[PDB]
Design an enzyme around this catalytic site. Structure first.
Site, PDB file in Angstrom:
ATOM      1  N   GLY A 106     -14.709  16.406 -28.659  1.00  0.00           N
ATOM      2  CA  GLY A 106     -15.942  16.228 -29.405  1.00  0.00           C
ATOM      3  C   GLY A 106     -15.854  15.189 -30.507  1.00  0.00           C
ATOM      4  O   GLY A 106     -15.218  15.421 -31.536  1.00  0.00           O
TER       5      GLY A 106
ATOM      6  N   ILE B 257     -18.201  11.670 -32.419  1.00  0.00           N
ATOM      7  CA  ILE B 257     -19.483  11.008 -32.634  1.00  0.00           C
ATOM      8  C   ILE B 257     -19.231   9.525 -32.877  1.00  0.00           C
ATOM      9  O   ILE B 257     -18.298   9.155 -33.599  1.00  0.00           O
ATOM     10  CB  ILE B 257     -20.256  11.628 -33.816  1.00  0.00           C
TER      11      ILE B 257
ATOM     12  N   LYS C 172     -15.842   4.713 -33.996  1.00  0.00           N
ATOM     13  CA  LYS C 172     -15.397   5.981 -33.435  1.00  0.00           C
ATOM     14  C   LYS C 172     -14.678   6.793 -34.505  1.00  0.00           C
ATOM     15  O   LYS C 172     -13.776   6.279 -35.179  1.00  0.00           O
ATOM     16  CB  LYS C 172     -14.469   5.746 -32.236  1.00  0.00           C
ATOM     17  CG  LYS C 172     -15.044   6.113 -30.875  1.00  0.00           C
ATOM     18  CD  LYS C 172     -14.040   5.788 -29.772  1.00  0.00           C
ATOM     19  CE  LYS C 172     -14.388   6.481 -28.461  1.00  0.00           C
ATOM     20  NZ  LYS C 172     -13.368   6.198 -27.404  1.00  0.00           N
TER      21      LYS C 172
ATOM     22  N   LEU D  31     -19.560  -3.534 -29.309  1.00  0.00           N
ATOM     23  CA  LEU D  31     -20.827  -2.822 -29.230  1.00  0.00           C
ATOM     24  C   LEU D  31     -21.515  -3.133 -27.908  1.00  0.00           C
ATOM     25  O   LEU D  31     -21.652  -4.299 -27.529  1.00  0.00           O
ATOM     26  CB  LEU D  31     -21.736  -3.211 -30.393  1.00  0.00           C
ATOM     27  CG  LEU D  31     -23.086  -2.492 -30.385  1.00  0.00           C
ATOM     28  CD1 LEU D  31     -22.890  -1.036 -30.779  1.00  0.00           C
ATOM     29  CD2 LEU D  31     -24.081  -3.182 -31.306  1.00  0.00           C
ATOM     30  N   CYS D  32     -21.965  -2.094 -27.214  1.00  0.00           N
ATOM     31  CA  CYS D  32     -22.538  -2.270 -25.892  1.00  0.00           C
ATOM     32  C   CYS D  32     -24.000  -1.850 -25.867  1.00  0.00           C
ATOM     33  O   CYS D  32     -24.481  -1.120 -26.738  1.00  0.00           O
ATOM     34  CB  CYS D  32     -21.742  -1.488 -24.849  1.00  0.00           C
ATOM     35  SG  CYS D  32     -20.078  -2.144 -24.671  1.00  0.00           S
TER      36      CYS D  32
ATOM     37  N   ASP E 173      -9.708   8.584 -15.456  1.00  0.00           N
ATOM     38  CA  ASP E 173     -10.961   9.251 -15.804  1.00  0.00           C
ATOM     39  C   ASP E 173     -12.183   8.347 -15.643  1.00  0.00           C
ATOM     40  O   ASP E 173     -13.171   8.523 -16.362  1.00  0.00           O
ATOM     41  CB  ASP E 173     -10.911   9.793 -17.239  1.00  0.00           C
ATOM     42  CG  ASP E 173     -12.075  10.713 -17.566  1.00  0.00           C
ATOM     43  OD1 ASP E 173     -12.562  11.408 -16.659  1.00  0.00           O
ATOM     44  OD2 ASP E 173     -12.509  10.728 -18.738  1.00  0.00           O
TER      45      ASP E 173
ATOM     46  N   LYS F  94     -15.652   6.906 -14.654  1.00  0.00           N
ATOM     47  CA  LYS F  94     -16.936   7.510 -14.322  1.00  0.00           C
ATOM     48  C   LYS F  94     -18.031   6.617 -14.888  1.00  0.00           C
ATOM     49  O   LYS F  94     -17.770   5.788 -15.765  1.00  0.00           O
ATOM     50  CB  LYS F  94     -17.054   8.934 -14.891  1.00  0.00           C
ATOM     51  CG  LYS F  94     -16.925   9.002 -16.412  1.00  0.00           C
ATOM     52  CD  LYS F  94     -16.983  10.428 -16.953  1.00  0.00           C
ATOM     53  CE  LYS F  94     -15.704  11.207 -16.667  1.00  0.00           C
ATOM     54  NZ  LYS F  94     -15.768  12.644 -17.104  1.00  0.00           N
TER      55      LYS F  94
END
Ligand SMILES: [Cl-]
Ligand SMILES: [Cl-]
Ligand SMILES: [Cl-]
Ligand SMILES: [Cl-]
Ligand SMILES: [Cs+]
Ligand SMILES: [Cs+]
Ligand SMILES: [Cs+]
Ligand SMILES: [Cs+]
Ligand SMILES: [Cs+]
Ligand SMILES: [Cs+]
Ligand SMILES: [Cs+]
Ligand SMILES: [Cs+]
Ligand SMILES: [Cs+]
Ligand SMILES: [Cs+]
Ligand code: NA
Ligand code: NA
EC number: 2.7.11.1
Lengths: 395, 395
Positions: free
Chosen positions: B19, B21, B35, B78-79, B122, B124
């Site tokens: 978890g 944000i 991050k 930044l995306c 991982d 995805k």
């Protein structure tokens, strides 16, 4: 915990849905869902409850049990899931024709509502609920959320779009939103929504008007695609013919719920074969230069693939008189005879054709995936006749 | 508000992801994402940051800017959105071949990682990020989230599945989960995931192993379908051939990232026509009873539809020597000649064929949607030869 209310007890531990929150609870020894609404919602609740007392008798309208201190509570039939959760979280490979059945039931419930002069105005997959299995493991769909329902006075065709909150984006008919439209919304608003729900189920989650971000924008534009419906699969051709009508931009071209229920989209293979037979009988003595026959043969060359004799298995082509291979009518006459003389039909023929009636009818629909749709449209000229009442809604 | 950090300042008003944000912020006059990780996350952060310093040079690995007091902060490129938001919220009708490009870039970044001895573990759609448009309005995909990355020691083929947290359900190769599998996971784990991402993009949101609820269960079972890929569309046939390999249950049958990049799935129409020409030249003097030719002709009757002469437009069938209509090789020889003499080709012929090279090659692939796939598989016998290096990865 386990808050108890007069005749309804629910524990806030079990939360079902959420501006209002729903919980699993119990009423008079019954498992039921419970609804709590804000004061501003307290007004919409009295509208919804009123209509549920009025229209809940129908199996495909959710059953309403009771309402019973600071806020308002609403108990209703407890369901297994919404139609949205059903489409998202279930392998249709195991469910068979159950999705179609859920669309049929949903349509039945809508036609119940319309017959009561009730326009739902907000139908969407999240609104349609799936029942818990009954004693026989059977389930059903049910309409809910009558908050935005309107009830039209007797002899009224439409209602004002203003002064009534529209549904949430993505499922709203263009007449509800466009400033340009002069004509007021009528019952067909729900048929447009239903048309989108039909596609949402068959495609296992797509939408005629694109992805959720631009749907409402595409709805006003009239930019819709049914990419998932193949142009040469019999099942897909039938589904497109109905869905195209339901989501039409002109509300006057959308079918009524009772038309939708009569549509071949809901016919068993048995009934499809019966329609083919009743048509073939009906036109057996009809003149070639006649209107009924003329209409059946227009654009028919494409329907039978120029020569249907050249597109059937050798066993049947061997067993085949005067049959003209470009005539839809002759293709039907052949089917009517092969069905009438199936027993007297040789074994290799019967083996290639398949079992009556399901495999038989599917032998031809598989080969000519536009034959039923072509014939259904053409034979509307006889919708009024008693013989074709099982296939058309006339009234 | 506008919390300032040493060399990184971000305002908690702008929240990007959760978890942990993530927030929009700024580093050294640069727009970047930020991050923040928990103490338990503080360990995974040092792993991720280490690898980004190591592998960020590649354009398709997200750029890492800096890390800079109670918790840990991580600034990165930044995306505009994740691949998931891209597939869900975008009309591909306007985007053209950009989705394929995003898969190619993503594959480039994975092959960069694998060449560094880094297994992602991982991958995805939520992990793959879409860049803000550059000065020319171009965008790119980038790999991120190296939390579960492992770096294999030199000369090591695999890694222990235990002691390492698997990705979240739905995208994990069966070797990661099944208790039965003896062989340890290797780099092909990422190819399986990528295979699923390929399908997720082409189908605009479906998955080989079913809906999200049963995916991982279906992955272990080996129950997968590619329903969205049509069996007679050239583009779909090519895509299925690659995706089927990538998602294979046997890890040893999955292609390496460098194989994937060589695959016709990423070829321009121009290059497809070139492959056809190099093949036709290559086999022009090859014996009919030879191995290369034998292989090209096995199951070829189906590929050319029994007689390709009978499936081309009349303009070209008129302009057609010794060509045997059941030979794939003769179908290729014809194409090589019609391409070589296109100018000297009459006008009605050139009009029916279309413009070189795109329309020309598409004239045939549209007619014979298995011809390229058949030929690519068959001609692997020449993968080692210098001439076919543009089409196969040999090493
Ligand atoms: Cl009426
Ligand atoms: Cl059942
Ligand atoms: Cl290697
Ligand atoms: Cl661009
Ligand atoms: Cs009911
Ligand atoms: Cs009515
Ligand atoms: Cs879908
Ligand atoms: Cs179907
Ligand atoms: Cs009947
Ligand atoms: Cs980079
Ligand atoms: Cs390596
Ligand atoms: Cs889809
Ligand atoms: Cs495509
Ligand atoms: Cs080249
Ligand atoms: Na009529
Ligand atoms: Na080789």
């Amino acid at each position: 915990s386990v808050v108890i209310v007069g005749k309804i007890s629910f524990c806030p531990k079990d939360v079902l849905g959420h501006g209002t929150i729903v919980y699993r609870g119990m009423f008079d020894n019954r498992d039921v869902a419970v609804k709590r609404i804000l004061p501003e919602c307290f007004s919409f609740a009295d509208r919804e409850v009123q209509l549920l007392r009025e229209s809940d008798e129908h199996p495909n309208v959710i059953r309403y049990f009771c309402t019973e201190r600071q806020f308002q509570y609403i108990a209703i039939e407890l369901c297994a899931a919404t139609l949205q959760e059903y489409v998202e979280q279930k392998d249709f490979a195991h469910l068979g024709l159950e999705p179609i059945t859920l669309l049929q039931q949903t349509t039945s419930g809508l036609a119940h509502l319309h017959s009561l002069n009730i326009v739902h105005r907000d139908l969407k997959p999240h609104n349609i609920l799936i029942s818990m299995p009954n004693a026989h493991g059977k389930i059903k769909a049910m309409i809910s959320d009558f908050g935005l329902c309107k009830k039209l006075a007797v002899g009224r065709h439409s209602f004002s779009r203003r002064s009534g909150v529209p549904g949430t984006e993505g499922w709203i008919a263009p007449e509800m939103l466009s400033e340009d439209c002069k004509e007021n919304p009528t019952y067909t608003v729900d048929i447009f929504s239903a048309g989108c729900v039909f596609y949402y189920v068959i495609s296992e989650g797509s939408h005629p008007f694109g992805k959720s971000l631009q749907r409402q924008a595409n709805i006003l534009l009239g930019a819709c695609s049914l990419d998932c419906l193949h142009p040469e699969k019999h099942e897909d051709v039938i589904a497109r013919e109905l869905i195209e009508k339901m989501i039409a931009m002109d509300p006057q071209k959308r079918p009524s719920a009772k038309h939708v229920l009569k549509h071949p989209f809901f016919w068993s293979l048995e009934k499809q074969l019966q329609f083919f037979q009743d048509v073939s009988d009906r036109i057996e003595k009809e003149s070639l230069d006649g209107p009924i026959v003329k209409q059946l043969e227009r654009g028919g060359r494409a329907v039978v693939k120029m020569d249907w004799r050249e597109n059937i298995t050798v066993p049947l082509q061997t067993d085949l008189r005067t049959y003209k291979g470009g005539s839809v009518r002759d293709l039907l006459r052949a089917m009517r005879n092969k069905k009438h003389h199936y027993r007297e039909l040789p074994a290799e023929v019967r083996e290639t054709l398949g079992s009556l009636p399901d495999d038989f009818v599917c032998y031809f629909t598989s080969r000519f995936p536009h034959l039923l749709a072509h014939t259904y449209r053409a034979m509307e000229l006889c919708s009024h006749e008693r013989l074709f009442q099982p296939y058309y809604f006339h009234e």
